[PDB]
Design a protein around this motif. Structure first.
Motif: not given
Ligand SMILES: O=C1Cc2cc(Nc3ncncc3Cl)ccc2N1
Length: 130
Positions: A18, A22, A25
């Motif tokens: 995760d 992130n 992104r």
């Protein structure tokens, strides 16, 4: 979910991936990117910390007190930019898009970047293809 790990702390199964998702992104949105890598006239924005975490070459560059302030890093102009792009994608996703058409360019680039586990994997796939 989570689990009770060897150390008896609670461990979160998806946390590392995760975090990486992130960070990718952020990279897609150009948020807090702090370096441009230039290859064969192509430019790639990234986070120095992620580069360092994945590559012996970037680790040496950014722990150098002189070079750690460079916001533009040129690579060997013979490096295949697609090879670089694939490896940068891997750094941020854990997924390596290895193909017969690109493997030699990916492996040469990984050797140059000191990405040892990627070099090993490329070696095994070539071994099998011969
Ligand atoms: O519980 C949570 C954990 C968490 C992380 C973030 N961070 C990001 N979200 C989306 N794209 C990039 C980033 Cl860096 C935002 C909200 C929440 N809420």
């Amino acid at each position: 979910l989570y689990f009770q790990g060897a150390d008896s702390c609670i461990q979160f199964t998806r946390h590392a991936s995760d975090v990486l998702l992130n960070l990718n992104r952020l990279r897609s949105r150009d948020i807090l990117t702090d370096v441009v890598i230039v290859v064969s006239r192509e430019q790639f924005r990234a986070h120095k910390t992620v580069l360092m975490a994945c590559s012996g070459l970037f680790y040496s560059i950014f722990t150098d007190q002189l070079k750690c302030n460079l916001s533009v890093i040129n690579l060997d102009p013979e490096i295949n930019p697609e090879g670089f792009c694939i490896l940068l994608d891997f750094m941020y996703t854990s997924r390596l898009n290895l193909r017969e058409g690109n493997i030699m360019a990916v492996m040469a680039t990984a050797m140059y970047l000191q990405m040892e586990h990627v070099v090993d994997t490329c070696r095994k796939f070539i071994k099998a293809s011969e």
